[PDB]
Amino acid sequence: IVYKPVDLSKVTSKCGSLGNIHHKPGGGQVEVKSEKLDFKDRVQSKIGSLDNITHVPGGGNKKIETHKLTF
Amino acid sequence: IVYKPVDLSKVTSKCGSLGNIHHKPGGGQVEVKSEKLDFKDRVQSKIGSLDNITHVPGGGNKKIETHKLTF
Amino acid sequence: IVYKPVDLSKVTSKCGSLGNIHHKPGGGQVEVKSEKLDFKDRVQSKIGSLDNITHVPGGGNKKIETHKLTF
Amino acid sequence: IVYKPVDLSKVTSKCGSLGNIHHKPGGGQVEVKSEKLDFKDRVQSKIGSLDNITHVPGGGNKKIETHKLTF
Amino acid sequence: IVYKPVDLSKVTSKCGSLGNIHHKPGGGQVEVKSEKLDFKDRVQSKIGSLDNITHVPGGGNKKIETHKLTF
Amino acid sequence: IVYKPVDLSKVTSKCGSLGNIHHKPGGGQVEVKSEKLDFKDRVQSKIGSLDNITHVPGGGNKKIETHKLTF
């Protein structure tokens, strides 16, 4: 019995913002005016002009390989 | 018995914003005026001019390989 | 019995902001004016012009290999 | 004056014996019998059953790029 | 004056015997019998069963790039 | 004057015998019998069963880049 398997495989993930050229994203002027407001419960507030985000919870990679030989 | 399998496979994922050239997204002027507002429950608020986002929760990669030989 | 398996495979993940050229993200002018506001519960507030973020909770990599030989 | 040319071109040459599968060329039995031969000038002789050859004297690749800007 | 040229090009040559699978070239039996032969000048002789050759005198690669800016 | 040229290009050559799988070249039986042969000048002789050769006199790579800025 002669057993000589070869793996040369590439198992790859490329995830997010990549290989990009000359990106010039512009946020404009943002004005928020708030007067005499009442909040009676929990508040979360975001005021921005530009968000650039790559999240990538994924992109995950998994290899299982399994050799059994028996006599 | 002679066993010599060969694997040269490429398992690949390319997910999100990639290989882009000259992107010039421009968010305009944003004005928010709020007066005398009453909120009796939880509030979440987002104000912004431009959002550039790549999420990629997926883009995952899985390889299962098995080689059982019996005599 | 002759057993000589060979693994030369590459398991890779490339996650986030990478290989980018000339990115010039520009946050605009941000103005927030607040008068006479009342909050009766927990508040969280984020004010900013530009956010550049790569989170990558993922991008994980797992390799299981096994070689059982029995006589 | 704004000058921002971008080149993403692929200049490629693929020359010879490539991407072939299961080639089994078989040269036959060759018998050469020579008796009482006379040679009065230079001799070059090749005897063989099978030749597999890729010459590729060419397959060359040339890229000339120029960017002159004047004021 | 703003000058920001970008080159991301690929200049490539792939020359010879490549990416081939399961090639089983077989030279046959070769017999050369020579008797009483007379040679009066330079001789070169090659006897063989199988020749597998990739020569590649070419496959060359040249890139000329120039960036002249004058004021 | 603002000058920021970027080169990320790849200049590559892949020449010879490469990326091949399961090549099993087989030279056959070679027999050479010579009797009473006369040579009156220079002789060169090659006898063999199998020749496997990659020469690659070429496969060369040349890059000229120039950045002249004058005022």
Side-chain angles (χ1 to χ4, degrees), chain E residues 8-69:
Chain E
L8 186 51
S9 61
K10 300 177 66 173
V11 191
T12 300
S13 60
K14 300 186 187 183
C15 299
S17 178
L18 64 92
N20 299 312
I21 298 102
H22 282 126
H23 281 220
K24 191 171 176 182
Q29 177 162 325
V30 180
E31 301 187 34
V32 185
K33 298 194 180 183
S34 296
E35 302 188 39
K36 206 172 176 175
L37 317 183
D38 300 352
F39 302 85
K40 293 190 166 70
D41 214 317
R42 299 174 61 167
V43 183
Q44 66 190 67
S45 179
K46 182 174 182 180
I47 304 172
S49 180
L50 173 57
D51 294 4
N52 308 293
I53 305 180
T54 78
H55 194 341
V56 200
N61 194 341
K62 182 175 178 178
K63 190 195 194 203
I64 297 183
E65 187 165 10
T66 290
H67 296 118
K68 190 179 191 174
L69 173 55

Side-chain angles (χ1 to χ4, degrees), chain A residues 2 4 8 14 21 26 51 66, chain B residues 3 7 13 20 27 52 67:
Chain A
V2 176
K4 310 190 187 180
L8 184 46
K14 302 185 187 185
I21 297 105
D51 295 0
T66 289
Chain B
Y3 188 93
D7 189 0
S13 60
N20 294 310
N52 306 292
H67 299 126

Side-chain angles (χ1 to χ4, degrees), chain C residues 25-42:
Chain C
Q29 178 162 326
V30 178
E31 300 187 35
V32 185
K33 298 194 180 183
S34 295
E35 301 188 39
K36 207 170 177 173
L37 314 186
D38 296 350
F39 303 85
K40 290 188 163 68
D41 215 317
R42 297 171 61 170

Side-chain angles (χ1 to χ4, degrees), chain C residues 2-35:
Chain C
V2 178
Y3 187 93
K4 306 188 182 181
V6 182
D7 189 1
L8 189 55
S9 61
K10 301 178 67 172
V11 189
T12 299
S13 60
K14 299 186 186 184
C15 300
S17 178
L18 63 94
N20 300 314
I21 298 101
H22 284 129
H23 279 220
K24 192 171 177 181
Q29 178 162 326
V30 178
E31 300 187 35
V32 185
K33 298 194 180 183
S34 295
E35 301 188 39

Side-chain angles (χ1 to χ4, degrees), chain F residues 36-48:
Chain F
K36 206 170 177 173
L37 315 187
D38 297 350
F39 302 87
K40 290 187 165 68
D41 214 318
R42 296 173 61 168
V43 184
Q44 66 192 69
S45 178
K46 183 174 185 181
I47 303 173

Side-chain angles (χ1 to χ4, degrees), chain A:
Chain A
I1 302 179
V2 176
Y3 190 96
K4 310 190 187 180
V6 183
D7 190 2
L8 184 46
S9 59
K10 302 179 65 173
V11 187
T12 295
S13 59
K14 302 185 187 185
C15 298
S17 178
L18 62 95
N20 298 317
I21 297 105
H22 284 130
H23 284 216
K24 189 168 175 180
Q29 176 164 328
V30 181
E31 300 190 36
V32 185
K33 301 195 177 185
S34 294
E35 302 186 40
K36 205 175 177 177
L37 318 182
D38 299 353
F39 304 84
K40 290 186 165 72
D41 215 316
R42 296 175 60 175
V43 181
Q44 63 188 75
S45 175
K46 185 174 183 180
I47 301 167
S49 175
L50 173 57
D51 295 0
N52 307 296
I53 306 184
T54 74
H55 193 340
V56 199
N61 201 330
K62 183 175 179 179
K63 197 200 194 199
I64 302 187
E65 187 168 8
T66 289
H67 304 88
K68 180 170 182 177
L69 175 56
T70 294
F71 195 96

